Amino acid sequence: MITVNEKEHILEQKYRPSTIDECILPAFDKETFKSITSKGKIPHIILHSPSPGTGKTTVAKALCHDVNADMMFVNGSDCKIDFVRGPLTNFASAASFDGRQKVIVIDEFDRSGLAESQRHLRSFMEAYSSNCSIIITANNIDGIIKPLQSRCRVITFGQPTDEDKIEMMKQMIRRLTEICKHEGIAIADMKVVAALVKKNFPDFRKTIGELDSYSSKGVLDAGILSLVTNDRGAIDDVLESLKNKDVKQLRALAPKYAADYSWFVGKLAEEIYSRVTPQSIIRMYEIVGENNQYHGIAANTELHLAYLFIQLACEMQWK
Amino acid sequence: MSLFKDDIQLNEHQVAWYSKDWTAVQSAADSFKEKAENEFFEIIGAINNKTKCSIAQKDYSKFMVENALSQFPECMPAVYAMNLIGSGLSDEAHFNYLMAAVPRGKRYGKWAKLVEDSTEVLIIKLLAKRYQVNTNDAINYKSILTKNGKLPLVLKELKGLVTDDFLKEVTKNVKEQKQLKKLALEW
Amino acid sequence: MKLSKDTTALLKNFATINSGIMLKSGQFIMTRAVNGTTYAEANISDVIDFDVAIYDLNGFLGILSLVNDDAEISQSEDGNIKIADARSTIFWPAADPSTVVAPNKPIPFPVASAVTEIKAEDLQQLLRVSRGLQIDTIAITVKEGKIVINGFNKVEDSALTRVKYSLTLGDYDGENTFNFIINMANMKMQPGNYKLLLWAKGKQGAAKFEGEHANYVVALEADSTHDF
Amino acid sequence: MKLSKDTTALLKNFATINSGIMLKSGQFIMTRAVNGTTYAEANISDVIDFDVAIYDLNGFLGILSLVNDDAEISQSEDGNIKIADARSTIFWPAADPSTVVAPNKPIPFPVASAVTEIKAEDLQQLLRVSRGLQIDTIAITVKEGKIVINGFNKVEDSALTRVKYSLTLGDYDGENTFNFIINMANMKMQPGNYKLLLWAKGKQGAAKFEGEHANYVVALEADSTHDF
Amino acid sequence: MKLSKDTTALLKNFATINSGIMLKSGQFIMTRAVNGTTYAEANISDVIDFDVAIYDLNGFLGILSLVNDDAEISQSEDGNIKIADARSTIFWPAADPSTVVAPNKPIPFPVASAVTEIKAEDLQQLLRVSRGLQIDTIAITVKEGKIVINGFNKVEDSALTRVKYSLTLGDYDGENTFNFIINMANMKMQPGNYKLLLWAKGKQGAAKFEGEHANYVVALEADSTHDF
DNA sequence: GCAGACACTACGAGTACATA
DNA sequence: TTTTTATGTACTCGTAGTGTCTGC
Ligand SMILES: [Mg+2]
């Protein structure tokens, strides 16, 4: 009951749901999409979520497939003002003899430069609402002008409730098992798939991409589990050194982050901010800013970073 | 008008689009715009009220936030703390520090500076442009001319410097249409 | 349905009134402006054998000129328009009926309040002088004995009292006066000899021009005095 | 080495394929698009007597248009291209041969799978219909035993199923079925009569337009189908 | 004053050299660039009856464009200026003479060190070639007994060694070898036949293009060598 | 033929970013 | 409730201006 595009070869594009029942939507979202398909007519919808891979384009194409709509797929960045005046009006004004509903799927239409192009679309809907319906998939909802959100039914993806999170994680684990049994990949440890789903949630496309990346040899053993669950590049070693006041560990690690100073500092501040007392928050931000301001003045950047580690480990009081 | 007394009562948008009147379509589509949402004043106020907020999807400007908060001395020790060391911090961390540090207060008002004029800023800008002196020396020149009494003669001399695109330098609001007549004939 | 060159020219003129047209079976093509400020009608040599609404008339006529004049126009099995040439078949889309503003019935013109005539040379001269002098509005009035047509400029003359052009059509015999004002962005005449009928009942009016090929009805502005 | 009007028109056409051309000595010029979606050669009358690579062919042809048709083109002592006129001498820069994406050898087209012929009038009207009906895709296929070019608009019809144009090329006596899709943005042929050879093998495919002077190999679209 | 078409075009050209211009009483008008790298003068047929300084010659000519040519321009009772033409009477401010930068003295060009002529078609070819080849400097020099303009691209050729254009102006018949480098941004002349007079002495020098309408005196670049 | 249609270019509005 | 830095740079889009080619 899985949908396979034999033409595609990217794993995250090969197994793309062709219907709403196949998706991993939350209970409320799946119920409302099923209701929309059962009603037979798609209203103006805006499927939006800052997290990529939640299912917006999949849901748009699946709706236009379920209701047998006369879908016209548009790259949103190509929906400039001439596109609204040109192909879009030609599409909406043409006659649908088959009775198929005309639906215009404007995928990834959150570009700001297309502000004017959206106004016309908002005017466009006021003149061709009966002829055609508009589905706008977007990531940054602030990029779609407010009148378009007022006219359209906005549906936010990628913020499921805790029960919905559990259910969709279970569904995604099941779907990844089906994908593995369909791709000729033997699953040695069943916890590896759960780890893949949990780490990359709610990005399902990244989940399938990581499944393809880690299934190089066709076996997902405890080594794959160690690779997935253990995130290289994190500051867990530095964080545990700071909490332990580990002088030797901080001294050894200081040259490891010497080259990538700015990003490491930003990540370090972002991570520590949530794990310290408010007064410790003020103090830590003060030290981080003061050290980062003298980044281009101090001679030894490695010793500079060691100084940063010393100060952070010293003046901090974990909650 | 409308020779046909039945019609179907098309709205503005249907008439504009169905007629392919792209001037009327542009006019009807311009009727949305809605330049609004005052993103800035709901950060500073939030900082003044320690209310939970997130700016990950928003646009944060450290200069405007610091200048706005500097109007209130109670928060300024924090601002100065970010005035020296916050240059390297990210916008997110800058906002986070200002959130954690700035004490709560019922503080509101208007920015402390010269309260515009559009009759005095233009004189200062014009004197600075004509005499090739800075804004401070332009203020000095205007203060001297007002006391001396030669200001109207100078304005009659350099009223020609006022032009179409010069007024936009003075201000961004749509009031320069009056300014063209303000010095239309100083005499 | 082979459309002659004269019919294509007439439809090209109609495309200046309305972008699209709902041409129905028979020898009658009507079209109207979407605001109803103007209307046309015409009887053509060719006979239309199928009902179809065209979203883009100018483009369709361009495609028609892009093939031979013998090209056979019909309706394809999918509902669109099929233009068959020696080897090339062109499939022009058929519009949704709701997206073209066309009149359901020809407007039944009542007994005309006045009847005059206008010559092709005078019509061309009027258009030429309007283009030259930026005359965006014309009007008809009765002086002491005759009927005259003049031009105004609503851009600069809000009262419509300064005359930039004038012309006399003929001698009018009667007892009622009128000053009928026509916006010049309505003169889609396709210049020729036109019998000019005018009707008005109250705070409303219409000016029909009957030609050898097509008739054009033009609405009059609200600020017109009927004096009937 | 003068460049005649025909050679200059040919090189102007080549400049729409590749921004610059590595033209070598002889009477033969070939070019390939930077992305390799359209290759072209031509056996031209004006003999070229020096290897030179032009990084900006359109600018070079514009400079040639500035001076008369009698301008003598040669290789300057510096190394550039010296266009000599009655009173003016222009030194167009010569590019490094490796900065101009050009073929190393003229690609040898295989034995054609299906051979047909498109006349100058048919190609011209196909291009004009493409401008009119806004079709950006064609598909050369078999219909009722005849090879037809179907013009689809890919923007509104992604699946290439609503035929907007259909031009019959000639009889097809073979027993294979194919649908070779060609982007109309890849049809950079100058007007003329073209013998249309089409070759396909699995995922490989091309369409050669053999002209009287210039031959244009065009890459088929990824969703082409055949059974060769 | 009345400003004919020719004088209006001349003033539009002068507006590129300087933003404004003091029109002094008489039939002679002149202007210079703000920095003083170029100067222009003309003997126009129209007669100016009052001194006036325009801070925005572009705006003044834009106002004059939409109004009829025969419009009368005079000074207002309150010190501004007024342009009156039948239906229109538009007032334009007159700035202080000391506000706008003008030479305040017609520069007397000394006896030329070398006199040649450049034809209108030759000058136009030089300008279009300069656009096409990205030529930004020219150098009027003596080559093999003729006087030639060599166009170099100073950006890619700091020392002006790689010649990109070469236009022969005519036989020299002198005894002094020079190389007068003129920036192409200083050449603001309108198309026409020009007598080119190059004067030099020590480290000072200039090049005067004397046309049938206006004379443009441009300044040579820094590294212009000569022996006058 | 030449008005009309198409292509190239410059400018303004808007956005985003870095820096002080 | 609560006004909006200055400078420099890069990109995109929409439109108006200009130049050139041309088809019933
Ligand atoms: Mg998407």
Side-chain angles (χ1 to χ4, degrees), chain B residues 123 127 130-131 140-159 183 186-187, chain E residues 96:
Chain B
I123 299 288
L127 279 193
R130 197 260 192 280
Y131 283 115
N140 177 10
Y141 283 154
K142 183 192 185 300
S143 310
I144 289 189
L145 282 172
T146 42
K147 299 175 176 57
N148 166 198
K150 278 188 197 113
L151 179 57
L153 277 55
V154 173
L155 303 184
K156 175 175 165 59
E157 267 164 15
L158 48 78
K159 78 212 193 151
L183 263 76
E186 279 288 334
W187 153 238
Chain E
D96 173 325

Side-chain angles (χ1 to χ4, degrees), chain A residues 116 119 123 127 273 282 286 289, chain B residues 17-18 26 29 85 96-97 100:
Chain A
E116 174 74 52
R119 270 79 154 269
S123 168
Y273 154 74
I282 283 92
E286 279 201 8
Chain B
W17 279 90
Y18 296 165
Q26 167 85 43
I85 83 192
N96 229 352
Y97 173 84

Side-chain angles (χ1 to χ4, degrees), chain A residues 40-90:
Chain A
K41 178 164 173 62
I42 306 109
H44 300 307
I45 315 184
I46 293 182
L47 316 164
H48 90 96
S49 69
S51 171
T54 47
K56 313 175 276 283
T57 308
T58 290
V59 160
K61 287 158 75 78
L63 275 151
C64 301
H65 177 275
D66 279 0
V67 311
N68 198 19
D70 188 1
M71 187 196 69
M72 145 171 195
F73 207 87
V74 182
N75 196 337
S77 187
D78 276 350
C79 192
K80 305 192 273 164
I81 204 178
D82 306 282
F83 196 94
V84 173
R85 298 167 160 162
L88 214 78
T89 323
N90 301 358

Side-chain angles (χ1 to χ4, degrees), chain A residues 56-57 107-108 137 205:
Chain A
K56 313 175 276 283
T57 308
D107 200 59
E108 311 298 315
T137 87
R205 187 209 282 109

Side-chain angles (χ1 to χ4, degrees), chain B residues 180 184-185, chain E residues 59-60 63 67 72-84 88-94:
Chain B
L180 260 287
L185 175 85
Chain E
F60 175 83
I63 278 293
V67 155
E72 178 76 12
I73 311 172
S74 183
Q75 69 158 45
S76 184
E77 300 282 324
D78 42 7
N80 326 62
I81 88 162
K82 46 184 283 188
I83 306 166
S88 295
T89 301
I90 316 177
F91 280 90
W92 189 265

Side-chain angles (χ1 to χ4, degrees), chain D residues 10 20 25 47 49 53 61 64 82 92 94 99 101 148 179 189 198 207 218 226:
Chain D
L10 184 51
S25 63
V47 53
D49 40 1
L61 294 159
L64 272 187
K82 165 180 176 174
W92 193 259
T99 73
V101 191
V148 290
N179 182 292
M189 300 99 58
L198 297 121
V218 179
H226 62 91

